[PDB]
Amino acid sequence: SLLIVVACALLDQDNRVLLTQRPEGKSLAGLWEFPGGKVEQGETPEASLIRELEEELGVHVQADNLFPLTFASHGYETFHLLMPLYFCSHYKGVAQGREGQNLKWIFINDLDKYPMPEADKPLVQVLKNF
Ligand SMILES: [Mg+2]
């Protein structure tokens, strides 16, 4: 019924945020989005995000370095999405697409230049003003 997904705005030395794009596979190029994933049973939201970032990007993050920013809340035909967004400017590893996905570091004021899922878009506005 209610799906909880956590996401992260990873910030580099130059105030670029990382967006990722699923591979084109057998059809067309997908949308740009914040890295993240489902919050699973027996995991805190922070644990889930930390694991997602390590699985997807080989980026290593400490819970004390994840800061709540905002959340999105979005109705779909068959479930409700609640999506907490964290920011993180202190992490270890070099982001690489470990699941064959595409990576793009984008200056914060430029994020709304890129096609993004409808749910991710209010989150972009919050990032610009912070
Ligand atoms: Mg994942």
Author numbering: 27 to 156
Could you share sentences copied from the article?
The amino-acid sequence of BH02020 is similar to that of the prototypical member of the Nudix superfamily, Escherichia coli MutT, a protein that is best known for its ability to neutralize the promutagenic compound 7,8-dihydro-8-oxoguanosine triphos­phate. Detailed features of the Nudix fold, a mixed β-sheet sandwiched between the catalytic α-helix of the Nudix box and a second α-helix, confer the substrate specificity of Nudix hydrolases.
The crystal structure includes two molecules of Bh-MutT, A and B, packed together in the asymmetric unit. At the C-terminus, electron density was missing for the last two residues of subunit A and the last residue of subunit B. The structure of each molecule in the asymmetric unit was similar; the Cα atoms of residues Ser6–Phe135 of the two subunits superposed with a root-mean-square deviation (r.m.s.d.) of 0.61 Å. Bh-MutT eluted from a Superdex75 size-exclusion column with a retention time of 68 min, a value that is more consistent with a 36 kDa dimer than an 18 kDa monomer (21-residue N-­terminal tag present). As observed in other Nudix structures, all of the polar conserved residues in the α-helix of Bh-MutT are orientated on the same side and are opposite the central mixed β-sheet. A small hydrophobic pocket formed by the side chains of Leu58 and Val64 is likely to play a conserved role in stabilizing the loop–helix–loop Nudix motif. The similar three-dimensional orientations of the conserved residues in the Nudix box of all known Nudix protein structures suggest that these residues play similar roles in all Nudix hydrolases, binding one or more divalent cations. This is true for Bh-MutT, as shown in the electron-density map in Fig. 4(b), in which the hydroxyl groups of Glu57 and Glu61 are near the Mg2+ ion at distances of 2.10 and 2.11 Å, respectively, which are within the expected Mg2+-coordination distance range. A gradual increase in ellipticity at 220 nm was observed for Bh-MutT up to ∼323 K, followed by a more rapid increase in ellipticity that leveled off at ∼335 K. Visual inspection of the sample after heating to 353 K showed evidence of precipitation, indicating that the unfolding was irreversible, and consequently the CD data could not be analyzed thermodynamically.
